[model samples]
Target: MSAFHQLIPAPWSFSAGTGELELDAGTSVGADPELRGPRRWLTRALGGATGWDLAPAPAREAGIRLLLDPSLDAEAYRLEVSDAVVISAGGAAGAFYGAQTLLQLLGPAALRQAPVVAVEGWSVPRVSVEDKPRFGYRGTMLDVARHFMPKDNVLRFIEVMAMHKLNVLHLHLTDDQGWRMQINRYPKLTETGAWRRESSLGSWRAGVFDGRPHGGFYTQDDLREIVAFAADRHITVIPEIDVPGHSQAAIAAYPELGAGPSPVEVWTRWGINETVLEVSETSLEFYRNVLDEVVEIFPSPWISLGGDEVPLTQWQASAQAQAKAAELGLDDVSGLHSWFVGQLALHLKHHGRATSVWDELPDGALVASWRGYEGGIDALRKGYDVVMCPEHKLYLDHRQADGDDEPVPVGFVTTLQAVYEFEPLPGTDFPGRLLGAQANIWSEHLDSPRRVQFAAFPRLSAISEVFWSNPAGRDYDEFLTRLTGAHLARLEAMGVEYRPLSGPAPWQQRPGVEGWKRDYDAEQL
Candidate 1:
């Protein structure tokens, strides 16, 4: 009875019986041909994790069944585990999610990449679960441009995100620090821009140095694999290409793309750079070709053309940019960035993709309101669909506590409770205007997969519950209880290096690193 009640985000409605479904070498995992990914995922994972070597069977005849149920919402699912487990879903996404829940019900050993327990120990409680996500976009914004994550690590997150029912990966692919996407048409985008001479030691304000070259990029085939892997789990990989600003890396690749300097190196520092994309026909054409390749690589209907924190210095200073801005009836810089973004938006829209900009443009397109809820609230008032990403509440890179133990603490102290208590949906009206929310793991300080895991779990678990479970009422104490039990074991079994409940493990703590933290009242620390 208790096992059924403790699922993270909990199920929409659930009940339990004093019974269970026993799994063995004879268990058959099956699904309709259309739901093959879910079928394959469960069969392969269960086999690999338990050494069961379970065979597949037809959807109806199988001991563990995955069947289509069109009566529910696209991502909704109904799971019943009795004599055998039956997972009925409205779509493959729902089916895949139900598979994740079913695996969790089998406990930690079921989540491993390889065998960790005896095959005879596999069983699921006699429970019934019917569930669906509260929003269309439960996402995570992973910033790899600042510090590249290996393809394997990127692939790991897709599975992790799927386990939590997080459906979208807003991959911050390119930035001034480094370019992480390969554009075939512009080979230079990777050849020249995908590398940096060195990196900041810790803080941009401190002018520290790491003194070692840092760079990496994903080939088109690598991205294809990422998208294909994510597709199996129903996770959309929305690639981000920063533009007008946060674009020194692109400029460094093709000199013509920049208006500021000749041969600008991929930026080594962390702050905003003046070397921005030139607002010219040639440059616009360059990015269009880039996005053409992007559209093919990522099937995600929404693409983010990052238009945040653009310093108008380059545009304001360049003669050609000045003429172009004036031609568009804008000053040297007043509306030049907007005009540039509009062109990209039009180009993307022509190819059947919608555009998203970072807390910047558009009632014209989807607004990713990242500064705070203020931008999202304003976007909602204008009837614009928005992604609410208030950094204060959702930046997972921020310190979880005030102590020096946090690894290069950046931004505000956004604790786990803070993340848990965040109300992503604010409006009483404009029903579908808010597309959902995401927790951002900016990779500036988090240079490895282990660090990403530390920042993401528990807090990310909170996000999962917030976005996956319908919001009627939320209690952090209850959430903490759910997390401290089975969920932490799931993280442990999957090789995730999550922060422990009490504090970071000795290695998880990185003391004495200078943090790019906000100015707080001294007493607050």
Candidate 2:
């Protein structure tokens, strides 16, 4: 169909039809018992738009129908809006996305505050949409560990992700700065590991401290609610417990876990530290218990055991690590890191969860290659599935523009156009081995929910399009026009503090608030 407005992540295929389908107070929604989740959501969304509480029908079929058609792909659906609205899908996820598109068709009014009148010309232009995602995994990684976001904010973010048809939320749960997820087996993981004395104020190079204590953690019950909330939106929450290297927080909680004699406090700075977990039985067992609890909280088929930027200084110096490597018949400290990762990977496999890691992992792990395309290429050559999230293109934490105008300007500039033009397959011969792509929002700069929102939006919208749409005939200029026209308004209605398309919004700029920036010193990497 002729594009109506800026539908973020354009549909696979669509055709405009004659006339429009009106939705108002008189509208009724109905679905089989199995479609209860989306049905309830649709009622709330439509009610928000039309200012009417549309009730579910008992006997008489409603004006709108949501049906399961197993013949379609699991995340694929067909939406037809003309005289009546019918959303048929192979699964609940598909049905939910189709409903989302239907709401999109109604324009920003469909997501804005309730209309003064029962019906304010609430109608969707006639269209037929046959849609499905290009990749199975379309994710946004939120690093809550650096600065913990409240559970409510996370729930809100999930709803926004669902709106964009993004299906995965990769939670960077543990880092050197803090630990965000609760582990029942280890109380200190939250009690001690979750808090830090202070965080770096500005650039890591500046070495200024915020001087205020910061900490927060999601309880098991909180996580359970989050999991269910994301599932309702057909999004998987893949929890990352970065280890060996980014284990200073965990080590702070349990000093015995570290190789050093003197206990190091949870890292107060931003850059990588030398306080990695020691290669020992106690450390391995500790992570096993952590993962055991993690697996129970998150039902995602894949769990991330972070295998990235592991400094070997500790391992190189530790006689214990050297002895362990010799005993295991390994070459050196690098092999030891892989062994440590493999131990956790094996534990996850035993518990019926697959392993996802930063690239350069041991055998049989899904590599989320963040460094560059070369990482994914190497991982693919070694027979590992790759999620292409290269830092230069997919890292949302990078400054969207050049120079000092951007808040917390860090890393290389990755403009909206750059993110939109991202090709996950990367002209690779082993394209089948590529799982999908994700954009990362490292919380070093994002100290608050508003900052998080500012950094993620527009760029994430672009990433969503790259993941969901066919690479052919992609139009960045058209997407920008649509984003500024409609999607930004919807984001405003939803109370999202998204960065504007033209330039930085007022709330984004703070003259001296220590906008965190990263340096490319080999030491930090």
List where candidate 1 sits over 4 angstroms from the true fold. 2-4, 361-364, 427-432, 519-525
lDDT of 1: 0.83
Q: Write the per-residue lDDT of candidate 1 for residues 175-248, one digit (tens) a residue.
A: 99999999887888899989899998777888878888988999999999999999888899899998878888
Give the poorly placed runs of model 2, Cα more than 4 Å off.
Answer: 1-3, 32-34, 58-60, 113-121, 361-364, 427-432, 513-525
Q: What are the Cα lDDT values of the candidates?
A: 0.83, 0.83
Q: Which ten residues in a row have the lowest lDDT in candidate 1?
A: 424-433
Q: Using lDDT as the measure, which candidate wins?
A: 1
CA displacement after TM-score superposition, residue 229 of candidate 1 (Å)? 0.3
